Design a protein around this nucleic acid. Structure first.
Lengths: 128, 63, 148, 195, 50, 102, 214
RNA sequence: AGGAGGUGCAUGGCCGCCGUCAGCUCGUACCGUGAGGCGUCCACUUAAGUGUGGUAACGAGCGAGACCCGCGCCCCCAGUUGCCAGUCCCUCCCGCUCGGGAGGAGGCACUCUGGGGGGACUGCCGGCGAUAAGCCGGAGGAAGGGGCGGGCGACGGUAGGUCAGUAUGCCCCGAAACCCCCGGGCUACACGCGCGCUACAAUGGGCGGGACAAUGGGACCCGACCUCGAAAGGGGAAGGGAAUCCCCUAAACCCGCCCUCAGUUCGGAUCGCGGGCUGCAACUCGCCCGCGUGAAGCUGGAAUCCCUAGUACCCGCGUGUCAUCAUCGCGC
């Protein structure tokens, strides 16, 4: 089963199937990703799911675009959609929207364009 | 501001006064009717007109 | 298992200490007198710096497949000071990794695809993934969860 | 490099326009079009009166047929002259007309109102005329006359209203004329009809 | 001896097509046109504001 | 097995649209297969220039934009089909480039 | 790297950071109980629309707020005892991982010095650093005069957290002593109403002045 | 003829500001002898001369808004954009032979892209508001109270600036005030001064590895890739006139380790040598590579600017001028 999730410019395509429990981002294990803070948010959603479903399926997600943290956000975003699609269980959906509404909603924030008069510093950054 | 534009307020009077029987409190029902009964090509003003004719109907039966 | 299943920080050191055995790779006479990059201001602190570099280079051949001189130069390039002006990104030197590539090819671990770069031999693949499986069999003990 | 062709043809397109405006100023240079065929380049000139563009026996256009092929380097140009359907709907043509009238020394108010009434009588919906420069003294002045309906800003004003600017010479200097014309056919977004 | 030296580079190399200035000549795929000139002719190019 | 790749460039989306309608309505009349019209990423050209003609005053700039739309249509090699494409009336704004690939 | 993956997996049972589940922590002061967030979270970094709501700071976790206060300490109007407190070198802003690591180490330092949950030490420090009076100018006919004023609890939280961060950053500035040590020491001093906590001292100062401007 | 020769208080357009401001006006009626007044005023609301209710006025025009562009959710169509989606088939590497990974076929899953349409309309509920206009609250929904960000900015003034870009009245020269060339200058210097970069270091400095963009741009061009030089760069050259080739990697961040707080293991100005690069030539008047060199500065009084959500801060990249040259301007 496929699932998509966008963030900033990060886009994540996840495929999940019956399996041991291995979770692979870009073909790399979920447990040895060097950014620890990003690893925590990557591993946040499935914790509420329970180890049964953690060990009942295998998940592989490929991300591209944005930064590492945007990539982690997109990965978690797509993860929640994929897993709730597999279960089709309302109770877990309630658990997610209790913990975080963006799990099945997403953050539509995007960068504002920079404007003249010191364009580099930002849309709202001006001289003295 | 959310003040309804003047010429929408004007144009909504005639649809009421000419087909009072063809409109109800339902927004979607009135939406198609105002879509056909005019030549509006902007969907946004179409929604505005539908909203105000809906409000006009809603205040009709009240008195 | 594969290199993808282990951290690179430990794997590069393991590969460096393993390749230190084979005499195909050797720092030339000018090696201890040249810093590791144009973007770098100071000489390497350690003297094993040569054998890590190859241990890095070969690693990318396992990942990025056929890659030539200039893209590798770009990857190792870094941020350098420019006086009062802010820092800027520059490219690593050429010969430093070029001779490393020649040494790796002569060792038979890698081969060349002209017009595209250099790819990794099945011998090099088997060597790297044997090191990786050694490391993973190790790591599964200190970290049980990697058994999954 | 297709983008190196699009703007190339474009910028060529208006160089001839300005050249003709320099040349056919007296005949009411109205508008230009160009179409490409294997035979060559067919140029279509809408003018207020093709009689003067013809000149005498077509000699004038013959001259125009030469330099166009040489100055602009267009392959086998063939020139076709046509009359503007309603010059009173063309802001550029009316602007040139009024500038010419002032260039005859006619009183500015008189010419302005006469031209305005003429254009409105031709079925236009709204006309604006602005005259700038030395009109009655050493210090410059700006005067406006408007009639009918005319949106001035926003997208519709950019598309529905014809604009035209003209420069008129005199002994005392130059005078600028802005002309805006709203043809009868156009409809504003604000206009809603009932059936 | 009264001919200007051909200049392949420098500001003297380029020249605005319309008004004949040596100043800022924009060359987005080669217009060869002055900055002041571009404003009066952009809508005629088909360019549009957004 | 031989196909014709056709690329149509147009600044006007609609001038493109009716020409695409012409070439697509050629297909079913000719009874020759036709892969759907592929819309390439529309190419945007941006140019910015300061409004002031002189140096004085604040800084204000104008950003002009050219959107040129690119579309691809790939069709089979049918002599009767391709004989009717040069008879298509094309507007001046639109341009057509055809390659014949195997 | 064993500590890294360890700390990664140990909070698998829903724990703040890596350790110190918050059921033990207790809010003694009645005022900040309905305003301090103690919900169970693994990673305290929402990126959420807390800014875009009137009271979106109620739902932000306390440690997240602490990291946020640490985020923005260098270079401004304030010159504590004639010091342009400025982080030219690798400023914490736009780098949340660095502050995350620093507060991680500060939590450990608090824990081993106190031998208890660092989070409860933070709660006590904030409770003991919160001012109770301020002043404001009120006029009538143009004659200004200062008037004593009470403070809304959320503002008390804000100023207490910012003052703790201020003291930590000032202490580490220009000094051999690292930043995490400065922060942990500031927290410890604040927890027990020690007058050398910059936060607690400034709390005493603001609670004065208003004392005499009633 | 020409003049970057004067005249912007001789002009035209064009630009800055007033000001994205809520404003400016007319037809008719009415009041006043008259300059003029009413409309355009009064209570509430608006982002608003936006509307609501009262008025000696009724309508209209310009402006506002509507208009148009990009983003955010969904439906359809579209496939040389994407994929062990699933994928039998073939090959290779590891291994505990279970399984793990890569390449070709493969079809459209899905991404991406561009055409059409829906979705958000105070839409519904509660309160406030006179029961009007409208406001607040609540639900649901990707998105609510002009959804968000933009473009379009009047009547008039600023004798503001622009005639040194164009056109341009008057006046001056007209072998000069016209044209071409050489050389220098347009940098020169005790400083007052606006706006920027760096430093004043634990945050750091140094060594390896790990995860990350898009704007764009590319034919006397982007150039992979091969070879050599520590490098600047040099010889060759695939692909590409552009979803197909290249610029191309991110940096900020973390991981394992060394230096451990000092004007110094910070900082590099300044100074010499050699080497490299563009241009005919770069002392005046370019950049880079290595060595030696190490300047002040250890937080800066008065004063004062900016910002309100992907916003401020930090970090880098593309792009105009360009053969090189930015701490330059615009954009990502």
């Amino acid at each position: 089963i496929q699932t998509t999730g966008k963030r900033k410019t990060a886009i994540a395509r996840a495929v999940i199937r019956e399996g041991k429990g291995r979770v692979r981002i870009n073909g790399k294990p979920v447990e040895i990703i060097e950014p620890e803070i990003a690893r925590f948010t990557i591993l946040e959603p499935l914790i509420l799911a329970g180890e049964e479903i953690w060990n009942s399926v295998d998940i592989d997600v490929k991300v591209e675009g944005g930064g590492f943290m945007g990539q982690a956000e997109a990965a978690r975003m797509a993860i929640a959609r994929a897993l709730v699609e597999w279960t089709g269980d309302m109770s877990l959906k309630e658990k997610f929207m209790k913990y975080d509404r963006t799990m099945l909603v997403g953050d539509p924030r995007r960068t504002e364009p920079h404007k003249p008069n010191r364009s580099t510093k930002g849309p709202r950054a001006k001289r003295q | 501001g959310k003040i309804r534009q003047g010429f929408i307020k004007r144009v909504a009077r005639e649809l009421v006064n000419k087909y009072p029987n063809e409109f109800t409190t339902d927004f979607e029902h009135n939406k198609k009717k105002v879509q056909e009964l005019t030549n509006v090509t902007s969907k946004k003003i179409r929604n505005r007109i539908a909203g105000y004719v809906t409000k006009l109907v809603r205040m009709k039966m009240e008195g | 298992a594969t290199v993808y299943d282990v951290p690179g920080d430990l794997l590069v050191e393991r590969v460096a200490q393993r390749l230190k055995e084979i005499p195909e790779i050797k720092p030339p006479e000018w090696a201890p007198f040249v810093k590791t990059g144009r973007h770098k201001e100071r000489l390497p602190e350690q003297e094993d710096w040569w054998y890590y570099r190859v241990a890095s280079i070969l690693r990318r051949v396992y990942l990025d497949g056929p890659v030539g001189i200039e893209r590798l130069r770009t990857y190792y390039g870094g941020r350098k000071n420019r006086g009062h002006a802010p820092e800027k990104f520059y490219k690593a030197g050429g010969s430093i990794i070029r001779k490393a590539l020649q040494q790796l090819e002569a060792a038979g671990f890698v081969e060349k695809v002209p017009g595209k770069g250099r790819v990794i031999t099945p011998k090099g693949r088997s060597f790297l993934d044997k090191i990786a499986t050694e490391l993973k069999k190790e790591l599964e003990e200190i970290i049980p969860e990697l058994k999954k | 490099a297709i983008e190196r062709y699009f703007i190339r043809e474009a910028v060529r397109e208006m160089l001839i326009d300005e050249f003709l405006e320099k040349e056919l100023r007296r005949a009411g240079y109205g508008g230009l079009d160009i179409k490409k065929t294997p035979l060559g380049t067919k140029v279509i000139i809408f003018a207020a009166n093709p009689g003067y563009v013809i000149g005498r026996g077509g000699r004038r256009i013959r001259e125009l047929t030469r330099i166009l092929e040489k100055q602009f380097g267009l392959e086998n140009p063939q020139i076709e002259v046509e009359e503007i359907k309603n010059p009173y709907l063309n802001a550029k043509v009316q602007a040139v007309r009024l500038a010419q009238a002032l260039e005859r020394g006619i009183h500015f108010r008189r010419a302005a109102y006469a031209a305005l009434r003429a254009i409105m009588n031709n079925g236009a919906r709204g006309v604006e005329i602005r005259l700038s420069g030395k009109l009655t003294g050493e210090r410059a002045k700006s005067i406006r006359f408007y009639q009918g309906y005319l949106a001035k800003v926003g997208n519709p004003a950019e598309t529905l209203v014809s604009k035209g600017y003209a420069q008129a010479l005199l002994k005392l200097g130059v005078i600028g004329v802005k002309v805006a014309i709203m043809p009868p056919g156009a409809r504003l977004p604000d206009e809603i009809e009932i059936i | 001896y009264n001919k200007r030296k051909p200049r392949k580079f420098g500001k003297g190399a380029r020249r605005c097509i319309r008004c004949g200035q040596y100043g800022p000549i924009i060359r987005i795929q080669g217009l060869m046109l002055c900055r002041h000139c571009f404003r009066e002719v952009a809508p005629k190019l088909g360019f549009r504001k957004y | 097995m031989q196909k014709a790749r056709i690329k149509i460039a147009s600044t006007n989306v609609r001038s493109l649209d009716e020409v695409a309608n012409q070439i697509k309505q050629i297909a079913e009349r000719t009874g020759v297969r036709m892969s759907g019209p592929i819309p390439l990423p529309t190419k945007r050209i941006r140019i910015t220039t300061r409004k002031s003609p002189d140096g004085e005053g604040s800084a204000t700039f104008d950003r002009w934009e050219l959107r040129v739309h690119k579309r691809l249509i790939d069709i089979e090699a049918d002599e009767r089909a391709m004989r009717q494409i040069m008879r298509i009336r094309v507007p001046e704004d639109v341009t057509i480039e055809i390659e014949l690939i195997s | 790297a064993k500590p890294l993956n360890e700390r990664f997996f140990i909070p698998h049972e829903i724990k703040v950071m890596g350790r110190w589940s918050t059921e033990d922590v207790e809010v003694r002061d009645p005022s900040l109980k309905p305003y301090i967030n103690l919900e169970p979270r693994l990673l305290p970094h929402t990126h959420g629309r807390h800014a875009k709501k009137h009271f979106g700071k109620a739902n932000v976790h306390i440690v997240e707020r602490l990291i946020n206060k640490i985020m923005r300490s260098g270079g401004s109007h304030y010159k504590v005892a004639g010091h342009f407190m400025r982080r030219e070198h690798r400023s914490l802003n736009s780098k949340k991982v660095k502050a995350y690591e620093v507060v991680k180490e500060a939590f450990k330092i608090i824990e081993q010095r106190t031998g208890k949950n660092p989070i409860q030490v933070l709660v006590w420090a904030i409770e003991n650093a919160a001012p109770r009076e301020d002043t404001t100018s009120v006029m009538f006919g143009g004659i200004r005069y200062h008037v004593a004023v009470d403070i809304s609890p959320m503002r008390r939280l804000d100023v207490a957290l910012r003052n703790i961060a201020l003291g930590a950053s000032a202490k580490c500035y220009r000094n051999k002593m690292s930043f995490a040590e400065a922060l942990a020491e500031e927290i410890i001093l604040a927890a027990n109403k020690d007058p050398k906590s910059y936060a607690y001292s400034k709390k005493l100062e603001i609670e004065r002045i208003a004392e005499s401007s009633r």
